[PDB]
Structure formats: C-alpha cells, structure tokens
PDB file of N, CA and C in Angstrom:
ATOM      1  N   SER A 255      -0.045   4.719  -3.243  1.00  9.24           N
ATOM      2  CA  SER A 255      -1.154   4.158  -2.482  1.00  9.24           C
ATOM      3  C   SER A 255      -0.658   3.097  -1.511  1.00  9.24           C
ATOM      4  N   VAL A 256       0.265   2.243  -1.958  1.00  7.47           N
ATOM      5  CA  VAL A 256       0.976   1.374  -1.026  1.00  7.47           C
ATOM      6  C   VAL A 256       1.803   2.211  -0.061  1.00  7.47           C
ATOM      7  N   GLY A 257       2.516   3.205  -0.587  1.00  6.65           N
ATOM      8  CA  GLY A 257       3.335   4.084   0.216  1.00  6.65           C
ATOM      9  C   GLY A 257       4.792   3.690   0.303  1.00  6.65           C
ATOM     10  N   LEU A 258       5.138   2.465  -0.086  1.00  7.42           N
ATOM     11  CA  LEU A 258       6.528   2.009  -0.066  1.00  7.42           C
ATOM     12  C   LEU A 258       7.221   2.347  -1.388  1.00  7.42           C
ATOM     13  N   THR A 259       7.212   3.638  -1.719  1.00  8.47           N
ATOM     14  CA  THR A 259       7.915   4.087  -2.920  1.00  8.47           C
ATOM     15  C   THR A 259       9.399   4.283  -2.629  1.00  8.47           C
ATOM     16  N   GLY A 260       9.728   5.256  -1.784  1.00 10.26           N
ATOM     17  CA  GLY A 260      11.097   5.404  -1.337  1.00 10.26           C
ATOM     18  C   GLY A 260      11.255   5.764   0.124  1.00 10.26           C
ATOM     19  N   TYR A 261      11.850   4.878   0.898  1.00 12.05           N
ATOM     20  CA  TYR A 261      12.358   5.233   2.219  1.00 12.05           C
ATOM     21  C   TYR A 261      13.778   4.742   2.437  1.00 12.05           C
ATOM     22  N   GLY A 262      14.105   3.556   1.937  1.00 11.29           N
ATOM     23  CA  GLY A 262      15.460   3.051   1.894  1.00 11.29           C
ATOM     24  C   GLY A 262      15.684   2.397   0.549  1.00 11.29           C
ATOM     25  N   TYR A 263      14.624   2.374  -0.255  1.00 12.50           N
ATOM     26  CA  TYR A 263      14.674   1.810  -1.592  1.00 12.50           C
ATOM     27  C   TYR A 263      15.518   2.687  -2.512  1.00 12.50           C
ATOM     28  N   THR A 264      15.980   2.084  -3.606  1.00 12.75           N
ATOM     29  CA  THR A 264      16.687   2.808  -4.665  1.00 12.75           C
ATOM     30  C   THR A 264      16.167   2.275  -5.998  1.00 12.75           C
ATOM     31  N   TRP A 265      15.130   2.922  -6.522  1.00 11.48           N
ATOM     32  CA  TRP A 265      14.587   2.534  -7.816  1.00 11.48           C
ATOM     33  C   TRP A 265      15.573   2.894  -8.915  1.00 11.48           C
ATOM     34  N   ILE A 266      15.843   1.940  -9.799  1.00 10.76           N
ATOM     35  CA  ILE A 266      16.748   2.139 -10.923  1.00 10.76           C
ATOM     36  C   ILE A 266      15.936   1.977 -12.196  1.00 10.76           C
ATOM     37  N   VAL A 267      16.081   2.927 -13.110  1.00 11.07           N
ATOM     38  CA  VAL A 267      15.127   3.116 -14.198  1.00 11.07           C
ATOM     39  C   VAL A 267      15.877   3.531 -15.462  1.00 11.07           C
ATOM     40  N   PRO A 268      15.455   3.114 -16.654  1.00 11.94           N
ATOM     41  CA  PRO A 268      16.143   3.546 -17.874  1.00 11.94           C
ATOM     42  C   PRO A 268      15.718   4.950 -18.287  1.00 11.94           C
ATOM     43  N   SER A 269      16.418   5.472 -19.295  1.00 14.29           N
ATOM     44  CA  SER A 269      16.180   6.835 -19.750  1.00 14.29           C
ATOM     45  C   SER A 269      14.828   7.008 -20.421  1.00 14.29           C
ATOM     46  N   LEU A 270      14.126   5.915 -20.723  1.00 13.25           N
ATOM     47  CA  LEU A 270      12.793   6.031 -21.302  1.00 13.25           C
ATOM     48  C   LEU A 270      11.833   6.720 -20.341  1.00 13.25           C
ATOM     49  N   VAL A 271      11.891   6.360 -19.058  1.00 15.05           N
ATOM     50  CA  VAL A 271      11.013   6.984 -18.073  1.00 15.05           C
ATOM     51  C   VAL A 271      11.427   8.427 -17.817  1.00 15.05           C
ATOM     52  N   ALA A 272      12.731   8.678 -17.693  1.00 16.28           N
ATOM     53  CA  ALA A 272      13.192  10.031 -17.408  1.00 16.28           C
ATOM     54  C   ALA A 272      12.769  10.998 -18.504  1.00 16.28           C
ATOM     55  N   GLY A 273      12.914  10.596 -19.764  1.00 14.03           N
ATOM     56  CA  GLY A 273      12.481  11.444 -20.863  1.00 14.03           C
ATOM     57  C   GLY A 273      13.193  12.779 -20.833  1.00 14.03           C
ATOM     58  N   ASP A 274      12.413  13.855 -20.875  1.00 17.73           N
ATOM     59  CA  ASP A 274      12.958  15.197 -20.720  1.00 17.73           C
ATOM     60  C   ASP A 274      13.286  15.412 -19.249  1.00 17.73           C
ATOM     61  N   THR A 275      14.577  15.511 -18.935  1.00 17.81           N
ATOM     62  CA  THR A 275      14.997  15.645 -17.546  1.00 17.81           C
ATOM     63  C   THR A 275      14.564  16.968 -16.932  1.00 17.81           C
ATOM     64  N   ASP A 276      14.211  17.958 -17.753  1.00 15.55           N
ATOM     65  CA  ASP A 276      13.732  19.226 -17.215  1.00 15.55           C
ATOM     66  C   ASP A 276      12.397  19.055 -16.500  1.00 15.55           C
ATOM     67  N   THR A 277      11.494  18.262 -17.069  1.00 12.33           N
ATOM     68  CA  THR A 277      10.142  18.104 -16.549  1.00 12.33           C
ATOM     69  C   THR A 277      10.084  16.843 -15.696  1.00 12.33           C
ATOM     70  N   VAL A 278       9.999  17.022 -14.386  1.00 12.42           N
ATOM     71  CA  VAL A 278       9.869  15.931 -13.427  1.00 12.42           C
ATOM     72  C   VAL A 278       8.435  15.941 -12.909  1.00 12.42           C
ATOM     73  N   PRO A 279       7.669  14.861 -13.085  1.00 11.53           N
ATOM     74  CA  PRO A 279       6.236  14.903 -12.763  1.00 11.53           C
ATOM     75  C   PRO A 279       5.928  14.975 -11.277  1.00 11.53           C
ATOM     76  N   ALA A 280       6.936  15.091 -10.413  1.00  9.90           N
ATOM     77  CA  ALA A 280       6.810  15.229  -8.965  1.00  9.90           C
ATOM     78  C   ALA A 280       6.243  13.980  -8.303  1.00  9.90           C
ATOM     79  N   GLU A 281       5.806  12.987  -9.074  1.00 12.38           N
ATOM     80  CA  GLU A 281       5.422  11.690  -8.540  1.00 12.38           C
ATOM     81  C   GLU A 281       6.572  10.698  -8.546  1.00 12.38           C
ATOM     82  N   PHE A 282       7.714  11.079  -9.096  1.00  6.45           N
ATOM     83  CA  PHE A 282       8.902  10.243  -9.041  1.00  6.45           C
ATOM     84  C   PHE A 282       9.531  10.351  -7.659  1.00  6.45           C
ATOM     85  N   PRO A 283       9.746   9.242  -6.960  1.00  4.88           N
ATOM     86  CA  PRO A 283      10.308   9.334  -5.611  1.00  4.88           C
ATOM     87  C   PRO A 283      11.734   9.856  -5.643  1.00  4.88           C
ATOM     88  N   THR A 284      12.089  10.599  -4.599  1.00  4.61           N
ATOM     89  CA  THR A 284      13.444  11.113  -4.484  1.00  4.61           C
ATOM     90  C   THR A 284      14.426   9.960  -4.329  1.00  4.61           C
ATOM     91  N   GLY A 285      15.548  10.052  -5.031  1.00  4.89           N
ATOM     92  CA  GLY A 285      16.508   8.974  -5.078  1.00  4.89           C
ATOM     93  C   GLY A 285      16.419   8.089  -6.299  1.00  4.89           C
ATOM     94  N   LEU A 286      15.586   8.441  -7.275  1.00  2.67           N
ATOM     95  CA  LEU A 286      15.486   7.667  -8.502  1.00  2.67           C
ATOM     96  C   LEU A 286      16.807   7.701  -9.258  1.00  2.67           C
ATOM     97  N   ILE A 287      17.153   6.574  -9.874  1.00  3.92           N
ATOM     98  CA  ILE A 287      18.383   6.435 -10.642  1.00  3.92           C
ATOM     99  C   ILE A 287      18.011   6.145 -12.088  1.00  3.92           C
ATOM    100  N   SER A 288      18.600   6.895 -13.013  1.00  3.83           N
ATOM    101  CA  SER A 288      18.336   6.698 -14.428  1.00  3.83           C
ATOM    102  C   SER A 288      19.635   6.779 -15.211  1.00  3.83           C
ATOM    103  N   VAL A 289      19.645   6.129 -16.371  1.00  4.11           N
ATOM    104  CA  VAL A 289      20.825   6.081 -17.223  1.00  4.11           C
ATOM    105  C   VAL A 289      20.559   6.852 -18.507  1.00  4.11           C
ATOM    106  N   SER A 290      20.908   8.129 -18.514  1.00  5.95           N
ATOM    107  CA  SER A 290      20.650   8.999 -19.648  1.00  5.95           C
ATOM    108  C   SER A 290      21.891   9.127 -20.514  1.00  5.95           C
ATOM    109  N   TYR A 291      21.669   9.508 -21.764  1.00  8.60           N
ATOM    110  CA  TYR A 291      22.767   9.775 -22.672  1.00  8.60           C
ATOM    111  C   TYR A 291      23.474  11.067 -22.273  1.00  8.60           C
ATOM    112  N   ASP A 292      24.693  11.239 -22.787  1.00  9.04           N
ATOM    113  CA  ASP A 292      25.517  12.401 -22.458  1.00  9.04           C
ATOM    114  C   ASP A 292      25.011  13.624 -23.221  1.00  9.04           C
ATOM    115  N   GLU A 293      23.814  14.066 -22.839  1.00  6.05           N
ATOM    116  CA  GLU A 293      23.272  15.300 -23.397  1.00  6.05           C
ATOM    117  C   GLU A 293      23.945  16.531 -22.805  1.00  6.05           C
ATOM    118  N   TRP A 294      24.421  16.435 -21.562  1.00  8.85           N
ATOM    119  CA  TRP A 294      25.047  17.580 -20.910  1.00  8.85           C
ATOM    120  C   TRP A 294      26.372  17.940 -21.567  1.00  8.85           C
ATOM    121  N   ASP A 295      27.189  16.942 -21.893  1.00  7.76           N
ATOM    122  CA  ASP A 295      28.511  17.195 -22.449  1.00  7.76           C
ATOM    123  C   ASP A 295      28.501  17.245 -23.973  1.00  7.76           C
ATOM    124  N   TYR A 296      27.982  16.206 -24.621  1.00  6.48           N
ATOM    125  CA  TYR A 296      27.900  16.172 -26.081  1.00  6.48           C
ATOM    126  C   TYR A 296      26.763  17.072 -26.541  1.00  6.48           C
ATOM    127  N   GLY A 297      27.103  18.322 -26.840  1.00  6.41           N
ATOM    128  CA  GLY A 297      26.175  19.229 -27.473  1.00  6.41           C
ATOM    129  C   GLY A 297      26.128  19.015 -28.971  1.00  6.41           C
ATOM    130  N   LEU A 298      25.302  19.823 -29.627  1.00  5.29           N
ATOM    131  CA  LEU A 298      25.140  19.695 -31.074  1.00  5.29           C
ATOM    132  C   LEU A 298      26.440  19.895 -31.844  1.00  5.29           C
ATOM    133  N   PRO A 299      27.280  20.897 -31.552  1.00  6.30           N
ATOM    134  CA  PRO A 299      28.544  21.012 -32.299  1.00  6.30           C
ATOM    135  C   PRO A 299      29.439  19.794 -32.173  1.00  6.30           C
ATOM    136  N   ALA A 300      29.406  19.103 -31.032  1.00  4.82           N
ATOM    137  CA  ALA A 300      30.218  17.902 -30.879  1.00  4.82           C
ATOM    138  C   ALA A 300      29.678  16.757 -31.724  1.00  4.82           C
ATOM    139  N   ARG A 301      28.356  16.587 -31.753  1.00  7.00           N
ATOM    140  CA  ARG A 301      27.772  15.446 -32.448  1.00  7.00           C
ATOM    141  C   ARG A 301      27.829  15.613 -33.960  1.00  7.00           C
ATOM    142  N   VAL A 302      27.675  16.842 -34.459  1.00  5.63           N
ATOM    143  CA  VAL A 302      27.734  17.051 -35.901  1.00  5.63           C
ATOM    144  C   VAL A 302      29.122  16.726 -36.432  1.00  5.63           C
ATOM    145  N   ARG A 303      30.168  17.007 -35.652  1.00  4.63           N
ATOM    146  CA  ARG A 303      31.522  16.692 -36.094  1.00  4.63           C
ATOM    147  C   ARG A 303      31.702  15.191 -36.283  1.00  4.63           C
ATOM    148  N   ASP A 304      31.191  14.390 -35.344  1.00  8.29           N
ATOM    149  CA  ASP A 304      31.285  12.942 -35.480  1.00  8.29           C
ATOM    150  C   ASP A 304      30.439  12.433 -36.638  1.00  8.29           C
TER     151      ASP A 304
ATOM    152  N   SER B 255      -5.649   0.694   0.508  1.00  8.72           N
ATOM    153  CA  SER B 255      -4.751   1.435  -0.370  1.00  8.72           C
ATOM    154  C   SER B 255      -3.406   0.733  -0.469  1.00  8.72           C
ATOM    155  N   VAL B 256      -2.889   0.244   0.661  1.00  9.04           N
ATOM    156  CA  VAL B 256      -1.789  -0.713   0.614  1.00  9.04           C
ATOM    157  C   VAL B 256      -2.240  -1.986  -0.083  1.00  9.04           C
ATOM    158  N   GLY B 257      -3.440  -2.461   0.251  1.00  9.14           N
ATOM    159  CA  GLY B 257      -3.967  -3.689  -0.282  1.00  9.14           C
ATOM    160  C   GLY B 257      -3.593  -4.923   0.506  1.00  9.14           C
ATOM    161  N   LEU B 258      -2.579  -4.831   1.362  1.00  9.14           N
ATOM    162  CA  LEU B 258      -2.147  -5.963   2.180  1.00  9.14           C
ATOM    163  C   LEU B 258      -2.982  -6.002   3.460  1.00  9.14           C
ATOM    164  N   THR B 259      -4.273  -6.266   3.270  1.00 12.38           N
ATOM    165  CA  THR B 259      -5.183  -6.422   4.399  1.00 12.38           C
ATOM    166  C   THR B 259      -5.245  -7.880   4.844  1.00 12.38           C
ATOM    167  N   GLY B 260      -5.714  -8.763   3.968  1.00 13.73           N
ATOM    168  CA  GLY B 260      -5.607 -10.181   4.239  1.00 13.73           C
ATOM    169  C   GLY B 260      -5.186 -11.020   3.051  1.00 13.73           C
ATOM    170  N   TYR B 261      -4.036 -11.652   3.152  1.00 17.34           N
ATOM    171  CA  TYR B 261      -3.648 -12.736   2.256  1.00 17.34           C
ATOM    172  C   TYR B 261      -3.064 -13.918   3.009  1.00 17.34           C
ATOM    173  N   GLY B 262      -2.257 -13.660   4.033  1.00 18.55           N
ATOM    174  CA  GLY B 262      -1.793 -14.670   4.960  1.00 18.55           C
ATOM    175  C   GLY B 262      -1.868 -14.111   6.363  1.00 18.55           C
ATOM    176  N   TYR B 263      -2.262 -12.844   6.451  1.00 20.38           N
ATOM    177  CA  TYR B 263      -2.433 -12.177   7.731  1.00 20.38           C
ATOM    178  C   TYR B 263      -3.612 -12.772   8.489  1.00 20.38           C
ATOM    179  N   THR B 264      -3.575 -12.634   9.813  1.00 24.13           N
ATOM    180  CA  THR B 264      -4.674 -13.041  10.688  1.00 24.13           C
ATOM    181  C   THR B 264      -4.952 -11.885  11.642  1.00 24.13           C
ATOM    182  N   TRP B 265      -5.820 -10.968  11.226  1.00 27.49           N
ATOM    183  CA  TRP B 265      -6.177  -9.842  12.076  1.00 27.49           C
ATOM    184  C   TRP B 265      -7.054 -10.317  13.224  1.00 27.49           C
ATOM    185  N   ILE B 266      -6.730  -9.879  14.436  1.00 28.07           N
ATOM    186  CA  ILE B 266      -7.508 -10.197  15.624  1.00 28.07           C
ATOM    187  C   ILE B 266      -8.019  -8.894  16.216  1.00 28.07           C
ATOM    188  N   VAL B 267      -9.253  -8.921  16.705  1.00 28.58           N
ATOM    189  CA  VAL B 267     -10.028  -7.705  16.932  1.00 28.58           C
ATOM    190  C   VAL B 267     -10.998  -7.925  18.090  1.00 28.58           C
ATOM    191  N   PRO B 268     -11.262  -6.928  18.930  1.00 26.36           N
ATOM    192  CA  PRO B 268     -12.223  -7.099  20.023  1.00 26.36           C
ATOM    193  C   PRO B 268     -13.652  -6.890  19.535  1.00 26.36           C
ATOM    194  N   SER B 269     -14.603  -7.130  20.439  1.00 28.23           N
ATOM    195  CA  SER B 269     -16.014  -7.038  20.084  1.00 28.23           C
ATOM    196  C   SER B 269     -16.431  -5.626  19.706  1.00 28.23           C
ATOM    197  N   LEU B 270     -15.645  -4.618  20.079  1.00 25.89           N
ATOM    198  CA  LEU B 270     -16.007  -3.242  19.765  1.00 25.89           C
ATOM    199  C   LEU B 270     -16.048  -3.010  18.261  1.00 25.89           C
ATOM    200  N   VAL B 271     -15.043  -3.502  17.537  1.00 28.17           N
ATOM    201  CA  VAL B 271     -15.018  -3.322  16.089  1.00 28.17           C
ATOM    202  C   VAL B 271     -16.081  -4.185  15.423  1.00 28.17           C
ATOM    203  N   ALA B 272     -16.235  -5.430  15.879  1.00 28.86           N
ATOM    204  CA  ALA B 272     -17.222  -6.315  15.272  1.00 28.86           C
ATOM    205  C   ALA B 272     -18.629  -5.752  15.413  1.00 28.86           C
ATOM    206  N   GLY B 273     -18.957  -5.218  16.586  1.00 32.19           N
ATOM    207  CA  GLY B 273     -20.262  -4.606  16.783  1.00 32.19           C
ATOM    208  C   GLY B 273     -21.380  -5.600  16.542  1.00 32.19           C
ATOM    209  N   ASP B 274     -22.361  -5.188  15.745  1.00 32.06           N
ATOM    210  CA  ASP B 274     -23.449  -6.081  15.366  1.00 32.06           C
ATOM    211  C   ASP B 274     -22.926  -7.103  14.368  1.00 32.06           C
ATOM    212  N   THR B 275     -22.903  -8.373  14.774  1.00 32.92           N
ATOM    213  CA  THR B 275     -22.365  -9.425  13.923  1.00 32.92           C
ATOM    214  C   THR B 275     -23.230  -9.697  12.702  1.00 32.92           C
ATOM    215  N   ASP B 276     -24.455  -9.171  12.664  1.00 30.56           N
ATOM    216  CA  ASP B 276     -25.309  -9.370  11.500  1.00 30.56           C
ATOM    217  C   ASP B 276     -24.866  -8.513  10.324  1.00 30.56           C
ATOM    218  N   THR B 277     -24.274  -7.354  10.591  1.00 30.26           N
ATOM    219  CA  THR B 277     -23.872  -6.414   9.556  1.00 30.26           C
ATOM    220  C   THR B 277     -22.358  -6.424   9.415  1.00 30.26           C
ATOM    221  N   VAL B 278     -21.884  -6.545   8.180  1.00 28.86           N
ATOM    222  CA  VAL B 278     -20.464  -6.508   7.860  1.00 28.86           C
ATOM    223  C   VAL B 278     -20.259  -5.420   6.815  1.00 28.86           C
ATOM    224  N   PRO B 279     -19.368  -4.457   7.039  1.00 28.39           N
ATOM    225  CA  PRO B 279     -19.239  -3.335   6.100  1.00 28.39           C
ATOM    226  C   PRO B 279     -18.537  -3.707   4.805  1.00 28.39           C
ATOM    227  N   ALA B 280     -18.292  -5.001   4.599  1.00 27.86           N
ATOM    228  CA  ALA B 280     -17.687  -5.577   3.400  1.00 27.86           C
ATOM    229  C   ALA B 280     -16.236  -5.154   3.219  1.00 27.86           C
ATOM    230  N   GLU B 281     -15.722  -4.255   4.055  1.00 28.57           N
ATOM    231  CA  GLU B 281     -14.312  -3.901   4.072  1.00 28.57           C
ATOM    232  C   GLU B 281     -13.528  -4.708   5.094  1.00 28.57           C
ATOM    233  N   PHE B 282     -14.198  -5.557   5.858  1.00 28.49           N
ATOM    234  CA  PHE B 282     -13.521  -6.436   6.797  1.00 28.49           C
ATOM    235  C   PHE B 282     -12.920  -7.617   6.044  1.00 28.49           C
ATOM    236  N   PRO B 283     -11.621  -7.863   6.167  1.00 26.62           N
ATOM    237  CA  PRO B 283     -11.009  -8.948   5.397  1.00 26.62           C
ATOM    238  C   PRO B 283     -11.527 -10.305   5.836  1.00 26.62           C
ATOM    239  N   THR B 284     -11.588 -11.224   4.879  1.00 26.81           N
ATOM    240  CA  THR B 284     -11.994 -12.589   5.176  1.00 26.81           C
ATOM    241  C   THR B 284     -10.949 -13.254   6.062  1.00 26.81           C
ATOM    242  N   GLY B 285     -11.405 -13.928   7.110  1.00 25.11           N
ATOM    243  CA  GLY B 285     -10.516 -14.507   8.091  1.00 25.11           C
ATOM    244  C   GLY B 285     -10.291 -13.670   9.329  1.00 25.11           C
ATOM    245  N   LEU B 286     -10.981 -12.540   9.460  1.00 21.87           N
ATOM    246  CA  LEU B 286     -10.874 -11.721  10.658  1.00 21.87           C
ATOM    247  C   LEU B 286     -11.365 -12.493  11.874  1.00 21.87           C
ATOM    248  N   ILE B 287     -10.651 -12.344  12.986  1.00 23.29           N
ATOM    249  CA  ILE B 287     -10.957 -13.044  14.229  1.00 23.29           C
ATOM    250  C   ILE B 287     -11.377 -12.014  15.265  1.00 23.29           C
ATOM    251  N   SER B 288     -12.492 -12.271  15.941  1.00 21.26           N
ATOM    252  CA  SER B 288     -12.975 -11.364  16.967  1.00 21.26           C
ATOM    253  C   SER B 288     -13.479 -12.148  18.165  1.00 21.26           C
ATOM    254  N   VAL B 289     -13.424 -11.506  19.325  1.00 18.07           N
ATOM    255  CA  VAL B 289     -13.914 -12.064  20.577  1.00 18.07           C
ATOM    256  C   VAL B 289     -15.244 -11.400  20.885  1.00 18.07           C
ATOM    257  N   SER B 290     -16.260 -12.208  21.164  1.00 16.09           N
ATOM    258  CA  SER B 290     -17.599 -11.689  21.370  1.00 16.09           C
ATOM    259  C   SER B 290     -18.257 -12.423  22.523  1.00 16.09           C
ATOM    260  N   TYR B 291     -19.235 -11.764  23.129  1.00 13.33           N
ATOM    261  CA  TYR B 291     -20.006 -12.385  24.189  1.00 13.33           C
ATOM    262  C   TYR B 291     -20.912 -13.469  23.616  1.00 13.33           C
ATOM    263  N   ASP B 292     -21.382 -14.350  24.500  1.00 15.18           N
ATOM    264  CA  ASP B 292     -22.207 -15.487  24.097  1.00 15.18           C
ATOM    265  C   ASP B 292     -23.649 -15.023  23.888  1.00 15.18           C
ATOM    266  N   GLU B 293     -23.841 -14.253  22.817  1.00 17.22           N
ATOM    267  CA  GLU B 293     -25.194 -13.884  22.417  1.00 17.22           C
ATOM    268  C   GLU B 293     -25.979 -15.103  21.951  1.00 17.22           C
ATOM    269  N   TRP B 294     -25.320 -16.007  21.225  1.00 15.10           N
ATOM    270  CA  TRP B 294     -26.002 -17.167  20.661  1.00 15.10           C
ATOM    271  C   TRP B 294     -26.508 -18.109  21.744  1.00 15.10           C
ATOM    272  N   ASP B 295     -25.697 -18.365  22.769  1.00 13.88           N
ATOM    273  CA  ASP B 295     -26.053 -19.340  23.796  1.00 13.88           C
ATOM    274  C   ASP B 295     -26.819 -18.700  24.950  1.00 13.88           C
ATOM    275  N   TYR B 296     -26.247 -17.666  25.562  1.00 12.96           N
ATOM    276  CA  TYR B 296     -26.877 -16.971  26.682  1.00 12.96           C
ATOM    277  C   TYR B 296     -28.020 -16.119  26.147  1.00 12.96           C
ATOM    278  N   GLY B 297     -29.182 -16.738  25.991  1.00 13.16           N
ATOM    279  CA  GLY B 297     -30.353 -16.017  25.544  1.00 13.16           C
ATOM    280  C   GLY B 297     -30.925 -15.130  26.633  1.00 13.16           C
ATOM    281  N   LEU B 298     -31.882 -14.295  26.232  1.00 12.64           N
ATOM    282  CA  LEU B 298     -32.494 -13.368  27.181  1.00 12.64           C
ATOM    283  C   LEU B 298     -33.152 -14.070  28.361  1.00 12.64           C
ATOM    284  N   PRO B 299     -33.930 -15.146  28.189  1.00 10.33           N
ATOM    285  CA  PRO B 299     -34.436 -15.854  29.376  1.00 10.33           C
ATOM    286  C   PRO B 299     -33.333 -16.399  30.263  1.00 10.33           C
ATOM    287  N   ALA B 300     -32.203 -16.806  29.680  1.00 15.28           N
ATOM    288  CA  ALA B 300     -31.091 -17.303  30.481  1.00 15.28           C
ATOM    289  C   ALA B 300     -30.466 -16.193  31.315  1.00 15.28           C
ATOM    290  N   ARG B 301     -30.285 -15.009  30.729  1.00 14.24           N
ATOM    291  CA  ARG B 301     -29.678 -13.910  31.468  1.00 14.24           C
ATOM    292  C   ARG B 301     -30.617 -13.366  32.535  1.00 14.24           C
ATOM    293  N   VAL B 302     -31.925 -13.384  32.274  1.00 13.51           N
ATOM    294  CA  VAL B 302     -32.880 -12.850  33.240  1.00 13.51           C
ATOM    295  C   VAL B 302     -32.849 -13.667  34.524  1.00 13.51           C
ATOM    296  N   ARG B 303     -32.954 -14.994  34.403  1.00  9.52           N
ATOM    297  CA  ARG B 303     -32.933 -15.837  35.594  1.00  9.52           C
ATOM    298  C   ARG B 303     -31.598 -15.731  36.316  1.00  9.52           C
ATOM    299  N   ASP B 304     -30.503 -15.624  35.562  1.00 11.28           N
ATOM    300  CA  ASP B 304     -29.198 -15.434  36.182  1.00 11.28           C
ATOM    301  C   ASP B 304     -29.126 -14.098  36.907  1.00 11.28           C
TER     302      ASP B 304
END
C-alpha cells in the first residue's frame, strides 16, 4: 500500500518467514534475503548418521 | 495508501481543487494551503457596482 517494498531495498529476513521455500506467497518482494538451514545439502541420510 | 499525506508536508493547491470552501471531503489533509478569490470581502453588491 505504501509501495516502497522493493526498488533498491534489500529486505533481510530469518528462516521463520521463509518457512517452506517451495511455497512463496507472491507478496514477498523480489530480492528478499533469508537465512535457511542446509536442507538442500544435508538430507535425511546425512543427518541420521550424525 | 502511502499514508504520507500530511505530517510535516505543506501541500499547496489552487482554487480548482478547493472548490466550494464550505464542503471538505474529509480526505484533504490538515494544513492544506489554497489560493482563492475574495469571496468573503468582495460581496455581490461590491462586484455589481465595480
């Protein structure tokens, strides 16, 4: 409604907001930065070993 | 929708927007400045003789 979501801004956000990275609510401005856990690399076989 | 209509701003406006000074659409920010003809002073008898 303000409209100053992203034009040169860089919103930085924790993994709580990102949640399931598959589902993006399309209201998140492009260029959002989040700090997620290594779900891509550490799969279940890797974590069970540890 | 931005909401930054008046907080320290000083909007200046011609008589066209002000229109009838008796009616205010309540969306005009407080502190709006407009230029208007001398309706208050130049009464109808004054304009007729002029």
